[PDB]
Structures are given as structure tokens and as C-alpha cells.
Design a protein around this ligand. Structure first.
Ligand SMILES: O=P(O)(O)OC[C@H]1O[C@@](CO)(O[C@H]2O[C@H](CO)[C@@H](O)[C@H](O)[C@H]2O)[C@@H](O)[C@@H]1O
Ligand SMILES: O=c1ccn([C@@H]2O[C@H](COP(=O)(O)OP(=O)(O)O)[C@@H](O)[C@H]2O)c(=O)[nH]1
Length: 400
């Protein structure tokens, strides 16, 4: 049985998701490696060790490990400073590569992509890469991310020019690569999926959450970042008379994605919205279906999203999604079949969008079931795993 190295440096697949350096990349590599181990592969998922009180090896499912390498300091470092920790990481990979001799390495970030680019000069292997965010789309915002990183753009160009395969999660991602990065390189459209056994209409959700069933609810699920546009959602909540906003997401006050940019609470006291904005905190990923099902609308008010995964998590639970028209959100959300699409930084358009589907609840209840069908059709992980597996089989078929 052949081995597989999955490299996700700041994304620990053994980590609970919902805070800084957590989220969709973590969920992506975790369910990918666990699905591949279910289909006859040996999977080692490589991440960075951030605490000596953490385990070195985490065995999730049979023949599926998470391996925390000692890259740099054994503390938390945000990814914008992890580049200097990368060559040591390379060395800490090589010992494992000395034992197993990985024929196939699938790197999942810029930083881990640089690690795979260093390994590509020394060893012969099938190298695949998923970006999970392009810096060239990141560094175009009138808000934050004008302070660029040309090292990131150089490496994100050098990955696409040299990797054997590049997994794009949306046709917008390939369009952004071909317009803004390079024309060379091989690419493959395999979109992100969700577990329909973990996301489903619960139909008992407000009784579990102790919420009044005749009161409207607007739902945000995601991280705390200026990228996510919670400012615009809170400003649009002031144009709606009834209804609470449940902000679900974790944060750490010692950290930047946390009480340095959980200033939304200040915006809660700006707009006099303390009676009708609830900060839920971090909810477990296997329990979010109750929050998605209890709500009348999930909002993804981002300023860019390379395949917003809470959109398909919400549509899987039968809840319509109002989202920005920026990235993979306009690949997931059909603007009149499953939800609505608004411009990013205007609260008036977002507020009129919420007004349309709070005033017509049966229309929201059929937008939600259409989102359920669309997720069952195109974004079911139980089929996307088979597509990924056949991709690995044909790439491993590159033999003598
Ligand atoms: O915002 P950045 O500094 O560019 O960091 C990228 C940010 O996005 C994460 C969340 O952990 O996930 C990305 O990839 C997943 C799946 O591919 C998407 O669902 C998600 O939309 C996308 O942001 C992660 O890479 C980083 O924190
Ligand atoms: O309390 C939370 C808050 C968020 N998430 C998950 O974190 C993931 C990240 O969502 P997304 O891809 O849309 O944004 P990202 O953070 O990955 O860029 C989603 O599956 C969310 O369900 C979670 O599990 N618990």
C-alpha cells in the first residue's frame, strides 16, 4: 500500500476549527486524508507543532496520521511570519521521506507549497497543490491587505509553473490564476465538498437552542477577520427593526484574529444593537447544523472568499445564503435559486437582501431546499472524495 504526504503547515488537521489559522483548509485536509485512508492509501498529514504539551502524532482513522513537525519556535506564529520557519520544516520532513519515500505529495497552502517546491528540486514525486487563497486576489482590497507580500506572489507563481497538478476549487480560482498569475501549469477543477451526514435539516433546532420560534434570526458563521466583513453585516442590522444576529466564531484576545479585530462589539455599541446581537463563540463543527437550521438566513458578507465553505454548509441544512459576489461564493450560490448575491461593502444592498427573505418565509424555505439539492448535486464530499481518489490513481499511474 502506497503512502501519501499531505503538507498543511499552519493548518493542523487535528485542530478544532473556528478561529485563527483554523477553518476550511483544516477541514479540507482532514476529510481528504481520512477519505483516502478509507480507500487504501497510507496518509501522513504534516503540520507544525505549536505546543510541546501537544501530541507529536495523532492517529485519527486507520492508516491516517497527523504529524506535528518541530519547525520553528514551539509557540503560535501567525502565517504571515512563518516563512523563516519553512526550511527547518523541510529538514523535519525529510526523515519521514527517508522512511516511506512518498510517491505523491499534496501541499495545501502557499507556505507548504514552498516546502513542496523545495522538495521538488531534490526528489521525484507527483506534486499537487491547493492554494486555499490567492495573494493576488487578497492584495486588491480598499480595506486591509494593501500591505502586500511579494514573496507570496513569487512563490504562488512558482508553484503553478512547477507543480504537477493544481487543484482549483472554483472556476473563478482558475480565472484569477490565468489572468493574474500565469498561463502555464496543469489545473483541475475539483470543488470543495461538505459532509451531508454532518449537515442536514434538523427540524428541532430552535427548541434545542431555546430560541423563540416566531422571532427572526440572521446567522453568521466564520472567523473574525476584516476579510469576512462583519462590519457591513452589523451596519445592515440597523436597517432591520426586528431580528437578532448570531455571530458564531472563535477568537483569542492574545491574537490578532481575536479581540484586536473583535471590535465588532464596539460596533455593537455604536449602532445601539446590544439587545439584538449575540456573540455565540466557537461551536463544534459537528454541531453547527443546529445553528444553520435554526436560522432564516446565513450571511457570508465577505470582501473575498475563495470558495466560502459555510455557504455549502448552510445550503446543506436547508437555509438560504446571502453572500458577497466575490469568489467561489458566486460559484456556490445561484443568485435566485438558492439565495442572493450582493456587492461587498454596502450595507444598504445587504439590508434590502435580508428584507426580501424575512418578509417571505416560504420563499426562503424553498430557496433552502434548492440549496440542499444543489449541495447534494455538486458539493457532496462523498462523491468529491471519489473524484480526488481517481485523480491520485491516474497521477500515480505515471510509472515506467
Ligand atoms: O486570508 P489569508 O491570509 O489568505 O488566509 C487564507 C485563509 O483561508 C483558510 C481558512 O483557514 O481557508 C481557505 O481555504 C478553504 C478551503 O480551500 C476555503 O474554504 C476558505 O474560503 C479559504 O479562505 C485558510 O487557508 C486561511 O486562514
Ligand atoms: O465555530 C465555528 C466557526 C466556523 N467553523 C468552520 O470553519 C470553517 C471555515 O469556513 P470557511 O471556509 O468558509 O472560511 P475560512 O475560515 O476557511 O477562510 C467552516 O467549516 C466553518 O464551519 C466551525 O467549525 N466552527
Amino acid at each position: 500500500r502506497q503512502p501519501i504526504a499531505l503538507i498543511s503547515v499552519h493548518g493542523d488537521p487535528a485542530a478544532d476549527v473556528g478561529h485563527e489559522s483554523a477553518g476550511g483548509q483544516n477541514i479540507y485536509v482532514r476529510q481528504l486524508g481520512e477519505a483516502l485512508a478509507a480507500a487504501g492509501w497510507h496518509v501522513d498529514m504534516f503540520t507544525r507543532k505549536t505546543d510541546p504539551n501537544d501530541p507529536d502524532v495523532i492517529e485519527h482513522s486507520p492508516h491516517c496520521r497527523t504529524i506535528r513537525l518541530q519547525a520553528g519556535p514551539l509557540t503560535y506564529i501567525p502565517r504571515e511570519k512563518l516563512f523563516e520557519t519553512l526550511p527547518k520544516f523541510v529538514e523535519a520532513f525529510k526523515a519521514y521521506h527517508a522512511k516511506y519515500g512518498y510517491p505523491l505529495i499534496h501541499t495545501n497552502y502557499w507556505l507548504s507549497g514552498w516546502v513542496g517546491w523545495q522538495l521538488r528540486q531534490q526528489f521525484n514525486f507527483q506534486w499537487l497543490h491547493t492554494y486555499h487563497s490567492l495573494g493576488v486576489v487578497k492584495y486588491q482590497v480598499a480595506s486591509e491587505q494593501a500591505q502586500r507580500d511579494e514573496t507570496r506572489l513569487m512563490v504562488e507563481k512558482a508553484i503553478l509553473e512547477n507543480a504537477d497538478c493544481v487543484i482549483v476549487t472554483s472556476p473563478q480560482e482558475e480565472a484569477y490564476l490565468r489572468r493574474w498569475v500565469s498561463k502555464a501549469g496543469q489545473t483541475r477543477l475539483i470543488p470543495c465538498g461538505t459532509n451531508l451526514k454532518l449537515f442536514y435539516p434538523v427540524a428541532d433546532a430552535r427548541a434545542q437552542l431555546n430560541l423563540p420560534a416566531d422571532e427572526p434570526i440572521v446567522l453568521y458563521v466564520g472567523r473574525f477577520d476584516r476579510r469576512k466583513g462583519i462590519e457591513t453585516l452589523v451596519a445592515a442590522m440597523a436597517q432591520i427593526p426586528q431580528g437578532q444576529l448570531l455571530l458564531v466564531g472563535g477568537s483569542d484576545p492574545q491574537r490578532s484574529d481575536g479581540a484586536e479585530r473583535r471590535r465588532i462589539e464596539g460596533l455593537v455599541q455604536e449602532y445601539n444593537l446590544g439587545d439584538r446581537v449575540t456573540f455565540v463563540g466557537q461551536i463544534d463543527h459537528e454541531y453547527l447544523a443546529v445553528y444553520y437550521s435554526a436560522a432564516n438566513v446565513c450571511v457570508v458578507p465577505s470582501y473575498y472568499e475563495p470558495f466560502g465553505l459555510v455557504a455549502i454548509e448552510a445550503m446543506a441544512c436547508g437555509t438560504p445564503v446571502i453572500a458577497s459576489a466575490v469568489g467561489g461564493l458566486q460559484f456556490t450560490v445561484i443568485p435566485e435559486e438558492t439565495g442572493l448575491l450582493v456587492p461587498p461593502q454596502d450595507a444598504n444592498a445587504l439590508a434590502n437582501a435580508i428584507q426580501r427573505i424575512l418578509a417571505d418565509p416560504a420563499w426562503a424555505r424553498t430557496l433552502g431546499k434548492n440549496g440542499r439539492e444543489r449541495v447534494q448535486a455538486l458539493f457532496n464530499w462523498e462523491a468529491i472524495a471519489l473524484q480526488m481518489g481517481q485523480l491520485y490513481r491516474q497521477l500515480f499511474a505515471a510509472s515506467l
